[PDB]
Ligand binder design. Structure first.
Ligand SMILES: Nc1ncnc2c1ncn2[C@@H]1O[C@H](COP(=O)(O)OP(=O)(O)CP(=O)(O)O)[C@@H](O)[C@H]1O
Ligand code: ICS
Ligand code: CLF
Ligand code: CLF
Ligand SMILES: [Fe+2]
Ligand SMILES: [Fe+2]
Ligand SMILES: [Mg+2]
Lengths: 522, 476, 262, 522
């Protein structure tokens, strides 16, 4: 039933007595469902130390992973260049998924094509699909550039991207000077951050490999910035703002900030802004190249050190105070510009915030996950705050990264109770937050399922989710946030101390029971 | 107009290379409600032209995302690399009642997460080991499906063997599904491979069993995936009408409901496209008749209730007329409130394989007109059903391209578009009101009398929103 | 400076034998050579290394977890004459995907810089039936630039040389990869050398050398050696030196013209 | 008891059984406390319509007001001037409170003096305190300027600030040229916003009244901006950023953003930034003067229109989409500068966010309160969003303003269920949220006690507090936010839609009851 003045959607509609009664009959009659008694006992068992031991013996099964595959990163990379169409050579199912995935995170259109390789293209190869596809795409959507990556099936069968594209050009499907950079992006290797590294390297090699002869390092007086797989619009914007503020000439290579934030003004723009082809061609002339997220830009770094001959600085991701400081001094060192009074003041305003909030953050325990550089940046900042990371999970992490993060942890009194996990998923993490309960989780939307689980055990075991990372599908416009630099650090500090205060108020909102500590002033 | 629309078709097609032009021309038509053989006017279910930004998915999405995934007390393994399973995790809102991770698993992502060694040496050993860990960590699971992603089908892993061997060792139904993404041309073949697997590995488990107590009023709901609770909202009407719903395929579905479906008297098929396969098979093997119904809006629902009740005795027909009399004042008030706000409005639709024709009824009940519609992956028998439901000189498109759909809308200028998440943000930026017609924009149900109320409210809130008058800056 | 060559030919024709005996002579001439085996049975370096070279690339990756964890030191060994050997590896017959194993191994060698010591020659030994893109990995751009096709006077061997040449064309047109010549590994057929010269002419290439059938080859093979190492004075041993000298001096690199069977 | 490894503060310590018992004995033995039965009965009665009728018949009793008194606004005004010491002539109790109130909201030092009038100065006048105080303040704290306001007692006894200051100067306690503007700020008239209007008008009168002879309107080609009582740092900044973006020469009169956000770098800066004495002297040469919060800058407006002869534009507070637009076009008409592309795009991005979040915002019902201009800005935006204001309260509001807002409400379908209240307090609003329950409250920290009350009635009756306004004492660093312009509207849009999604997740987090609607993607 519906009262026309107050229509109910699925919640709370299905709580009406007639639906509830109907669902009771469904279950009893046809579901052959395990008794509630058993379900509760099984549930309780999965929260124990013994279930954790079994759970951590897994060797073949993955449950709720915290990563996606390579071409997702390639697509994001390709999106960052002017009038560029991401083009994924292989099965079209993948593209439908990549677009949907980014649509939901960005609440924006996401442009990308497939060349629709079917069963006969599986056994004969995708040479024809690549010919017809490059021609059709150029004609219909008119990009300046098409950036080609691969699905897993094109990789199993070894479709030679370089040859397929050269024959397309040789046979007149697209003009020879029409730029078609490529990168093999196999999904069964690494993860989506690895796909970003691979795609960027293809494009950079495409524009600079032939013509190294006339390049002189330092001759355009600018600093190359490579951001890596990045999904906070504010992150592109803050790097650009701090460099402009210092007077540093800079060149952001892969810049999707504009095209992922177009205005609603009556027209759809498939393309907007981004790194130009001329900027890439000119990149080897820069003073140096800074990699924002080095732990997934290793292939890019070898090409840039080897072919461009830049002394790429050893910098951590510029998150939190020390590493933002370190980033700014090194940009200062490369370019000759001193650090302006305006950035120095901003630094002291983040310090002021740390001093103001330290009593509430101190000793607070967090479980967290995400991509390698993000996680280590977030871990470093939690330590600078007097917080205790407890469970650090990075599913797409490696042994060397794990070694670096264990060193940061051990350098501080606040890391004594923390352990780093690589190769482990969100079902592992779920066990950890039941057996060794932290105060909060910091991760993406997928963590809401953990929070629901911890709550089902009991309100005193509930571990709230703090949404920082990618993808965030169940809040709106968090993709406009910042995590880098001083600006990112202020936002994170504010998100953290206020999650802490929001939770405390909930635990103290009980009339004449807990509200003696329901303070007006915190 | 008929000639004007034909002209619009020829102009749009001018941008394509000749091969893509000759083909895309076969998939765009000007409707004739008089025509009953759609082959004459349009062709569908062909492979997409490369590089044209089709909105179509793959066989795996069709099988795992759509048919298998909703079955709540089985564990569905995304077999292969980590991507597929991760982009589809809790993306489709197939609602279910259960204790997730204990006796129910719908929102979870299970995968074998192929690395390079698993590609080169094959993954049957890992798959076997994977099933042992599952049975350890989720002992209340009532069965397991193995949903092959692209590379499982290339390298020739023997998942049927692993399923017979491990299933015997554990006395567990394990269903191997070859829903390799490169098979077919879209989601559609995945439905089919999903239905044949239900048939081959589950539907017959109780062929010899006669313990289940059957009545002349037993029916199954086939082809409702309970988006936002659509099926729960349908089920209540059927039962108030005195029918007993033994099964729901596959929204809120259990593996035991599926095994008990052969004991019903009539199969109620909502989504024809995705489950007409198993319905024909159940008629051939068990003698069970099946019929298509539509619970979108009051007119279609009222007509469907009467048609279904006519398959039984006069008692059920009496109860039919009761249910109708009960919800009559409720759907009439919805009409009185929302139709004056929607009358005369024009909508263009683009969805998968059922809704582009199925929901036309609900729009008309609010005084709206469907000026254009098309499918991602229907077959010609869907377009046979479609053309009498559309008005004359309306536009029909199949596997429409991002470009084509963009340009059609520029000329036709509808007040509302109802399509998917990939379409959404393109058309909002154009100042055109947009409703998601797969996910229902996280709202719904829209099925039945209770859904129609949410349906009316959603179409009006969006179309008549104050944000749509704000797109131009006053100064330009 | 560096020359990369890929050896193709009909299944069972003598590629791995011919390749290894050539390289032996090449090393004996003072060349720095690497052999890259691209066959799941991993037999391509078995005669340069006596008895064993236990460690294939895929094997070590499977054991080590991932290819990225694997260091160059683990899979590349030296045998007779300082010849460097590495094997792709892959699955046993009937399971997994040997093609992808080749892609991964060749990609590993590139990423780890295996090509930049001070090498004169790189040889890729490929299996007989080239069933997929993986097994053309050695003839992509920046891989082999010279291909030599092993054949003989019988109908089937020549038919194969022609079909491999068609598979080459797409890699030859769009790249720098070129056919170097046909090497005739005799089966003692009538007027056989003339016959292979004729075939070479129709393709647009030459027959670089006629290698006689001599059971010392198999006798040395049973000893896990090249003829060069097993018996340096034998007539067959001088044959491989002649073949070796000619490959060093070859300048003929063509795009082949495949014929219609009539 | 305490565990040395896991020490408990007051919460949850006193939930230990021995404290619980000790409290049970305290109550029973000595409190003579009304039976729980009666307490529950009176409580239920305070949630009903009948109590509301009594509650709304009040004529003399005020409970939980939503305003402060004039000198607080006066102090905030003076702080915004270069090296200026706020000086409140009267009782020192007032000053200790003013600083505290601002300390807790801004989490910064707050400098202000009293001249400590005691019982004898009450009866003899504050002449002497004023002589010694100015001399002592000037010597010890060395401001460039001293801005004198009054406590309620100095207003009752009629202390003539003008006379007392001149006699201070004639007698050499402070130099004759040393700037000492003043304003009578009685706490029993209006409130803290009226105090700001009074202070600013006194300072402006001080620097420009004598010398109107040599002023020509429009000659410095700048636009004067007067912010009014504003407690979001970001609001000063967004106005400064948008004018600069347009190339409009501007002069912000009363600018405390710097002094309220000094860096923690090792030294205390009592003063920083602010409007210079020269800017004030030069103000009448500006093209025109824009008042950001007209509904409490009426005294200022009469002085600037009357004396400076600026044709002060008829502008609403620039909040939400229409009034930001309206503000930008008017600044464009006055200065001659076009509206730049970067602002046009900023507008389309706010529109884009509104199109993206509208299905969740639609029909949501709000109770809200705060200051006159803030409230009406907030009401106008909610209507632009498709939301339904229901209870609009403004305690320090007046009858004309009430009319202005009822007209705005009537201009939209979404205002049909709203009522505006002036003169009514937070104990009045509490009845409103029990008898006519909205979905959320938008207000300041004082609202947390209302939420505590609604929850004690029932989880289904709980009305969550969304903290936007002044003062905010129980979250950290919210004072850095923005509420004006497109940037302000984006922040407000994001807070509202995510408060809605956060609450829905809470209502659907119940395992096997409501979590069928616990969706990953919202
Ligand atoms: N010139 C020659 N005279 C006599 N026997 C020879 C010969 N060349 C090769 N053989 C023998 O023929 C057999 C095949 O040699 P080889 O293994 O090198 O062939 P191949 O590599 O083409 C097979 P595949 O395609 O499966 O890799 C070996 O036993 C070898 O000793
Ligand atoms: S199953 Fe089909 S695309 Fe029949 S694959 Fe698709 S939940 Fe659509 S038009 Mo998404 S044939 Fe269902 C469908 Fe229709 S996923 Fe849903 S909305 S009624
Ligand atoms: S048609 Fe999968 S998303 Fe792809 S690159 Fe492979 S991991 Fe990543 Fe369908 S079954 Fe899946 S989604 Fe495609 S791969 Fe095929
Ligand atoms: S010593 Fe006097 S009793 Fe003490 S705090 Fe001061 S007034 Fe009160 Fe003041 S704060 Fe404003 S101006 Fe009057 S109302 Fe009140
Ligand atoms: Fe958007
Ligand atoms: Fe502070
Ligand atoms: Mg061989």
């Amino acid at each position: 039933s519906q009262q026309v003045d107050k229509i109910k959607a699925s919640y709370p509609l299905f709580l009406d007595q007639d639906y509830k009664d109907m669902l009771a009959k469904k279950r009893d009659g046809f579901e052959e469902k395990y008794p509630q008694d058993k379900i509760d006992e099984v549930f309780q068992w999965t929260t124990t130390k013994e279930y954790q031991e079994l759970n951590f013996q897994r060797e073949a099964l993955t449950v709720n992973p915290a990563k996606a595959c390579q071409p997702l990163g390639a697509v994001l990379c390709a999106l960052g260049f002017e009038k560029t169409m991401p083009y994924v050579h292989g099965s079209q199912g993948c593209v439908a998924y990549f677009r949907s995935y980014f649509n939901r995170h960005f609440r924006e259109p996401v442009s990308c094509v497939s060349d629709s390789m079917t069963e006969d293209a599986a056994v004969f190869g995708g040479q024809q699909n690549m010919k017809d596809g490059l021609q059709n795409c150029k004609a219909t959507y008119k990009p300046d550039m098409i950036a080609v990556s691969t699905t897993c099936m094109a990789e199993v069968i070894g479709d030679d991207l370089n040859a397929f594209i050269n024959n397309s050009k040789k046979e007149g499907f697209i003009p020879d000077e029409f730029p078609v950079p490529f990168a093999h992006t196999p999904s069964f290797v690494g993860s989506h951050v690895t796909g970003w590294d691979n795609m960027f390297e293809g494009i950079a090699r495409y524009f600079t490999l032939k013509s190294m002869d006339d390049k002189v390092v330092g001759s355009n007086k600018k600093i190359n910035i490579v951001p890596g797989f990045e999904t906070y619009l504010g992150n592109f914007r803050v790097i650009k703002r701090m460099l402009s503020e210092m007077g540093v000439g800079y060149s952001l290579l892969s810049d999707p900030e504009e095209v992922l934030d177009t205005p609603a003004d009556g027209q759809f723009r498939m393309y907007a802004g981004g790194t130009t082809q001329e900027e890439m061609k000119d990149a080897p002339n820069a003073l140096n190249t800074v990699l924002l997220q080095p732990w997934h830009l290793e292939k890019t770094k070898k090409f840039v050190e080897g072919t461009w001959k830049h002394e790429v600085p050893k910098l951590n991701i510029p998150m939190g105070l020390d590493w933002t400081d370190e980033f700014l001094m090194k940009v200062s060192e490369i370019s000759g510009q001193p650090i302006p009074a305006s950035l120095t003041k901003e630094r002291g305003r983040l310090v002021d915030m740390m001093t103001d909030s330290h009593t509430w953050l101190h000793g607070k325990r967090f479980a967290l996950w995400g991509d390698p550089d993000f996680v280590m940046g977030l871990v470093k900042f939690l330590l600078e705050l007097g917080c205790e990371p407890v469970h650090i999970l990075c599913h797409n992490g490696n042994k060397r990264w794990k070694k670096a993060v264990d060193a940061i942890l051990a350098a501080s009194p606040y890391g004594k109770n923390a352990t780093v996990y690589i190769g482990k998923d969100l079902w592992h993490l779920r066990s950890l937050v039941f057996t060794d309960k932290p105060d909060f989780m910091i991760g993406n939307s997928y963590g809401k399922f953990i929070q629901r689980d911890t709550l089902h055990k009991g309100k005193e075991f509930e571990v709230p989710l703090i949404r920082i990372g990618f993808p965030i599908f169940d809040r709106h416009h968090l993709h406009r946030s910042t995590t880098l630099g001083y600006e990112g650090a202020m936002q994170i500090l504010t998100t953290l101390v206020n999650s802490i205060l929001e939770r405390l108020d909930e635990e103290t909102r009980g009339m004449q029971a807990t509200d003696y500590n329901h303070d007006l002033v915190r | 107009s008929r000639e004007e629309v034909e002209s619009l078709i020829q102009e749009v097609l001018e941008v394509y290379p000749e091969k893509a032009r000759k083909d895309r021309n076969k998939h765009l038509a000007v409707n004739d409600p008089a025509v009953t053989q759609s082959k004459k006017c349009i062709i569908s279910n062909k492979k997409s032209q490369p590089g044209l930004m089709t909105i179509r998915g793959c066989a795996y999405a069709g099988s795992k995302g759509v048919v298998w995934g909703p079955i709540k007390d089985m564990i569905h393994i995304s077999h292969g690399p980590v991507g597929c399973g991760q982009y589809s995790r809790a993306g489709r809102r197939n609602y279910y009642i259960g204790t997730t991770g204990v006796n129910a698993f719908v929102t979870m992502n299970f995968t074998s997460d192929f690395q390079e060694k698993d590609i080169v040496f094959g993954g049957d050993k890992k798959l076997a080991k994977l099933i042992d860990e599952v049975e350890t960590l989720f002992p209340l699971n009532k069965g397991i499906s193995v949903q092959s992603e692209c590379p499982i089908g290339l390298i020739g892993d023997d998942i049927e063997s692993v399923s017979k061997v491990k299933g015997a060792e554990l006395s567990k139904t394990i269903v191997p599904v070859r829903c390799e993404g490169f098979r077919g041309v879209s989601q559609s073949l995945g439905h089919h491979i999903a239905n044949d697997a239900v048939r081959d590995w589950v539907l017959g488990k109780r062929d010899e069993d006669t313990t289940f107590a059957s009545t002349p009023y037993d029916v199954a709901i086939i082809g409702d995936y309970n988006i936002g609770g659509d099926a729960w909202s349908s089920r209540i009407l059927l039962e108030e009408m005195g029918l007993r719903c033994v099964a729901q395929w596959s929204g809120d579905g259990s593996i035991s409901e599926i095994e008990l479906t052969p004991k019903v008297k009539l199969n109620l098929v909502h989504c024809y496209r995705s489950m007409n396969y198993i319905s024909r098979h159940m008629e051939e093997k068990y003698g069970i008749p099946w019929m298509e119904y539509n619970f979108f809006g009051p007119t279609k629902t009222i007509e469907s209730l009467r048609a279904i009740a006519a398959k039984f005795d006069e008692s059920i027909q009496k109860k039919c007329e009761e249910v109708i009399a009960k919800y009559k004042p409720e759907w009439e008030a919805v009409v009185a409130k929302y139709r004056p706000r929607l009358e005369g409005k024009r909508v263009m639709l683009y969805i998968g394989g059922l809704r582009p024709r199925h929901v036309i009824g609900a729009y008309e009940d609010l005084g709206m007109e469907v000026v254009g519609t098309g499918y991602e992956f229907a077959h010609n028998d869907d377009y046979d059903r479609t053309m009498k439901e559309m008005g004359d000189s309306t536009l029909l498109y199949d596997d429409v391209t991002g470009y084509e759909f963009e340009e059609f809308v520029k000329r036709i200028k509808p007040d509302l578009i109802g399509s998917g998440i990939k379409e959404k943000f393109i058309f909002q930026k154009m100042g055109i009101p947009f409703r998601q017609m797969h996910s229902w924009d996280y709202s719904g149900p829209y099925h039945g009398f209770d859904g129609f109320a949410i349906f009316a409210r959603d179409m009006d809130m969006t179309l008549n929103n104050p944000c749509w008058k704000k797109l131009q800056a006053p100064w330009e | 400076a560096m020359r990369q060559c890929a050896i193709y030919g009909k299944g069972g024709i003598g590629k791995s034998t011919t390749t290894q005996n050539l390289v032996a002579a090449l090393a004996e001439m003072g060349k720095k050579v690497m052999i890259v085996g691209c066959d799941p049975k991993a037999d391509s370096t078995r005669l340069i290394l006596h008895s064993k070279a236990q460690n294939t690339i895929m094997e070590m990756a499977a054991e080590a977890g991932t290819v990225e964890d694997l260091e160059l030191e683990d899979v590349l060994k030296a045998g007779y004459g300082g010849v460097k050997c590495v094997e792709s590896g892959g699955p046993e017959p009937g399971v997994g995907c040997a093609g992808r194993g080749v892609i991964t191994a060749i990609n590993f060698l590139e990423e780890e810089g295996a090509y930049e010591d001070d090498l004169d020659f790189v040889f890729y030994d490929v299996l007989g039936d080239v069933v997929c893109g993986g097994f053309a990995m050695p003839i992509r751009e920046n891989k082999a630039q010279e291909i030599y096709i092993v054949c003989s006077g019988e109908m089937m061997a020549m038919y194969a040389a022609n079909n491999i040449s068609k598979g080459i064309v797409k890699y030859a047109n769009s790249g720098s990869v070129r056919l170097g010549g046909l090497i005739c590994n005799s089966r003692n057929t009538d007027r056989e050398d003339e016959l292979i010269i004729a075939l070479a002419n129709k393709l647009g290439t030459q027959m670089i050398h006629f290698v006689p059938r001599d059971n010392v080859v198999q006798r040395a093979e049973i000893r896990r050696m090249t003829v060069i190492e097993y018996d340096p004075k034998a007539k067959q041993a001088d044959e491989y030196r002649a073949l070796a000298r000619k490959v060093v001096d070859n300048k003929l690199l063509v795009i082949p013209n495949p014929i219609t069977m009539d």
